[model samples]
Target: NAMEILYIKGDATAPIGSGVKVITHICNDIGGWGKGFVLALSKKWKMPEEAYRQWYKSQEEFTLGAVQFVNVENKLYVANMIGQHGIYKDSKGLPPIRYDAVRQCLKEVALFTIAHKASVHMPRIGCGLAGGKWELMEQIIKEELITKEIAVTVYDL
Candidate 1:
């Protein structure tokens, strides 16, 4: 049961129509919310950023493969997936984006979507500030969400 993926040119924050349950974006654990899709999200809603800050401060394992679901409105949630550490590398020269983390987070999101009987919406996650390749993210999305029959949409702004 492959899920249908639709591409539309517009702001990802715009309404995704009825039956769409969640809007997700990549986040880091450093408590810095100044870049990427989260920035746009901050402009629209404050709960996601606040929740993410709280999660980042409280959680011990706040790195790759962690997810926090923030309820935005009725039947609409924001998934803060910690798929990166920071936008730039540390002194060790490590990259920000972790593909494995993204995959794991999406796996959780897929199960969540199925349990809720709803669709998922997101931007080209992990590509911009996270420094991930879209091809890899696409493959992970296919494996984690599409194959599970969860509808997903990617918005390009």
Candidate 2:
């Protein structure tokens, strides 16, 4: 099913009707403390709230995990990190931390915005939280967003 992001231990294609999903372990769990890893980055960078928000608007990325929704007029974007203990799946079938899950989640959110007649911005997700390799993550995210007709910015923050 396109709605659920499938996770598998080895290489295998989804059944005919199933969508391809990205696979990897949790990002924050890769090497060290998940919370501290992000916190240190935040502290070291001194990510100011206002500045972050402004920067987000300029880049048009939603910072997930941060749980902040920045909207300019009718445009809405969700700024979050996958495993920052912030973003959650809206439905039970949505996969977690996999490339497909991230894509579907973004799609759903974008659809919600559109239903309300709001423009949308989405950040590349799961790559940061799934501890997946960057190149693979980038490819998957690019394919997903481009296919779904969503606009996004890849931010280093």
Candidate 3:
């Protein structure tokens, strides 16, 4: 059968359906915050930002390819994928978006979705300030989630 993922044009934080268990987006580990879809998330809920801050402070493994899960409600969760290191480049001239890290993070997200029996929701993750390629990110989502028979929904605003 063809993939069942859906694409819709709207705010991603709005309630999709009662069955939607998780919403996800890319995050940086070097304390870079604000901008992009995260602004929307911050506007909607305080816990997500607070939780991310707590995780960032306590975790030592802050680097490329890390994943953090924050519970929003009874069954609603936020999957923070550490696909970016900082808001900008370092001495090495590395940009914020890291495809390799994104791929690794999505791999974990796929597993989490399977384990929780939850559908996934996101924007064109990493396409904005993160500077990622949507086409490549889509392929990674297909491989990590769609191919594994998980339901995914992508939102646009």
Candidate 4:
């Protein structure tokens, strides 16, 4: 079996490690905010949300599978990954969480991690409002991040 990720009981926003740390989470493509784990991020720093709101109108890369890295501090950063399609779940019982899109987002996140030499911190992303399964999310994280031996920690708070 592969080396499992570090699961800790604490806040995802408050990641523990040395050097650069990246706090990651899923975002909807419709440019929605003020809900889910993002609330925690918003409470911590205003720039992440401010930067996201700016990009929604200023750029075309705000679509699914794309990611935006915002600086919370010099070494601390937040990854706003477009893993969800829209704000709400569909009537057919399908949630907004796009697993394939998440895979792509993680792929981009991996490259950033490598370049910055950073560790990743996140919640059970997409599981809250996006209605994602952690099992599937973990698989993609493993394939995209674990394969490269990136240090990742999932916070439970």
Q: What is the C-alpha lDDT of each candidate?
A: 0.83, 0.36, 0.82, 0.89
Q: What count of clashes does model 2 give? A: 11
Off by over 4 Å in 2: 1-75, 79-96, 116-124, 127-129
lDDT of 3 by residue, 1-157 (tens): 4666789988778748766477888988776668888889889888888878887888767667988888888888888888887887777876688888888998888888888888889988988666788888888888888888888889988
- How much is the lDDT of residue 149 in candidate 3? 85
Query: For residues 62-150, could you state the per-residue lDDT of candidate 1 as single tens digits?
Result: 77898888888888899999888776977787778888888889888988899899888899887765678887788888888888788
Q: Score residue 154 of candidate 4 by CA lDDT.
A: 95
Q: Using TM-score as the measure, what is the rank order of every candidate, best first?
A: 4, 1, 3, 2
Q: Write the per-residue lDDT of candidate 2 for residues 5-92, one digit (tens) a residue.
A: 3222321111112222211112211123234233433343333234344544564444332222333222222323323223333266
CA shift of 74, model 1, Å: 1.1
Q: Which lDDT tens digits does candidate 4 get at residues 1-157?
A: 3556889999998889889999999988888888978899999899889989988988778889999999999799899998897888788878899999999999899999999999899998877778899988998988888778888899987
Better of 1 and 4 by lDDT: 4
Per-candidate RMSD, Å? 1.6, 13.5, 1.7, 1.3
Model 4: how far residue 85 lies from native, Å: 1.3
Total clashing pairs for each candidate: 0, 11, 0, 0
Per TM-score, the best of the predicted structures is 4
Please give each candidate's TM-score. 0.92, 0.36, 0.90, 0.95
| Candidate with the larger TM-score of 1 and 4 | 4
